[PDB]
């Protein structure tokens, strides 16, 4: 989906 | 408490993280519409506030296969493309 904040949960 | 906006002062890391992510997401979402060109610019901006492009590039390559990224890489250089589009007139055979 249009929410690239997957990896960003790491910081 | 206080207000909320994009690029408030940058001294705060949390604000930079919020905006950085807002751009990361906004870009993916605009590309979800098809505005790849804006994704290149917006991603370039994400790098402008991160200052660690390569870390983010590894993070973008592993989270999902990014075709846009490839276009970001093609948007950056201009002269390079001209050499290829002459040297071997774009593409040539070998024997």
Curated annotation (Swiss-Prot), chain A:
Cell compartments where the protein resides: Mitochondrion matrix
Description of post-translational modifications: In response to mitochondrial stress, the precursor protein is ubiquitinated by the SIFI complex in the cytoplasm before mitochondrial import, leading to its degradation. Within the SIFI complex, UBR4 initiates ubiquitin chain that are further elongated or branched by KCMF1.
Motif position, SIFI-degron: 1-11
Tree of life domain: Eukaryota
Family: Belongs to the aldehyde dehydrogenase family.
Assembly, per entry: Homotetramer.
Function according to Swiss-Prot or TrEMBL: Required for clearance of cellular formaldehyde, a cytotoxic and carcinogenic metabolite that induces DNA damage.
Protein name, entry field: Aldehyde dehydrogenase, mitochondrial
Originating organism: Rattus norvegicus (Rat)
Swiss-Prot record, chain B:
Coiled coil feature spans: none
Keywords, ordered alphabetically: Isopeptide bond, Membrane, Mitochondrion, Mitochondrion outer membrane, Phosphoprotein, Protein transport, Transmembrane, Transmembrane helix, Transport, Ubl conjugation
Localisation per UniProt entry: Mitochondrion outer membrane
The keyword Ubl conjugation is annotated on this UniProt entry: yes
Residues with Phosphoserine modification: 85, 88
A biological-process GO annotation: tRNA import into mitochondrion
Covalent cross-link Glycyl lysine isopeptide (Lys-Gly) (interchain with G-Cter in ubiquitin), where: 6, 11, 18
Gene Ontology CC terms, in alphabetical order: cell periphery; migrasome; mitochondria-associated endoplasmic reticulum membrane contact site; mitochondrial envelope; mitochondrial outer membrane; mitochondrial outer membrane translocase complex; mitochondrion; sperm midpiece
Post-translational modification: Ubiquitinated by PRKN during mitophagy, leading to its degradation and enhancement of mitophagy. Deubiquitinated by USP30.
Source taxon at top rank: Eukaryota
Bilayer topology annotation: Single-pass membrane protein
GO molecular function, one term: mitochondrion targeting sequence binding
Cytoplasmic side, ranges: 1-95
Family stated for the protein in its record: Belongs to the Tom20 family.
Function: Central component of the receptor complex responsible for the recognition and translocation of cytosolically synthesized mitochondrial preproteins. Together with TOM22 functions as the transit peptide receptor at the surface of the mitochondrion outer membrane and facilitates the movement of preproteins into the TOM40 translocation pore. Required for the translocation across the mitochondrial outer membrane of cytochrome P450 monooxygenases.
The protein's assembly and partners: Forms part of the preprotein translocase complex of the outer mitochondrial membrane (TOM complex) which consists of at least 7 different proteins (TOMM5, TOMM6, TOMM7, TOMM20, TOMM22, TOMM40 and TOMM70). Interacts with TOM22. Interacts with APEX1. Interacts with TBC1D21. Upon mitochondrial depolarization, interacts with PINK1; the interaction is required for PINK1-TOM-TIM23 supercomplex formation which is critical for PINK1 stabilization at the outer mitochondrial membrane, kinase activation and downstream mitophagy.
Name listed for the protein in its UniProt record: Mitochondrial import receptor subunit TOM20 homolog
Lineage summary: Eukaryota, Metazoa, Chordata, Craniata, Vertebrata
Portion of the parent chain present: 51 to 145 of 145
